[PDB]
Ligand SMILES: CC(=O)OCc1ccccc1
């Protein structure tokens with residue numbers, strides 16, 4: 001297991017524009033296109049991202065390319081964030097994957113309310129952090145995925161993805 005395999009499991013792979021769990025236009029391995037209700041707006045974002053006129057459909061190679069860019073962007077966003085970087089650098093590699101997973105799903109703003117969870121993770125109070133992480137809109141709206149990520153933080157193993 002690695003972050004790419006983990007997120008590929010959590011996000012799936014679809015080569016035509018679809019709606020994510022929140023109803024937003026998405027493609028590939030969970031690449032958000034837009035929060036606008038306009039399919040044309042989503043198609044424009046797609047063409048801009050791929051560099052050609054796609055009319056809502058991409059290849060597997062293109063999906064994987066976008067996915068690599070998106071994972072890298074999540075990592076670099078963590079490393080540029082004064083709140084997240086110290087916590088990230090305190091973690092082992094398996095738990096760093098759980099961290100990237102959350103940023104990929106919710107972005108830096110989506111994790112802003114997790115200050116207490118972040119402190120517990122930095123303190124390595126894993127069971128306490130797991131309890132706190134579940135007290136969230138995130139867990140309630142995507143509980144199976146959140147449970148996998150939380151188990152990864154709790155145990156430091158890949159057991160939830162095996
Ligand atoms: C904020 C959160 O709970 O997950 C994202 C994260 C976690 C630890 C370090 C960096 C980002």
Ligand SMILES: [Cl-]
Pocket residue numbers: 141142143144145146
């Ligand atoms: Cl879920």
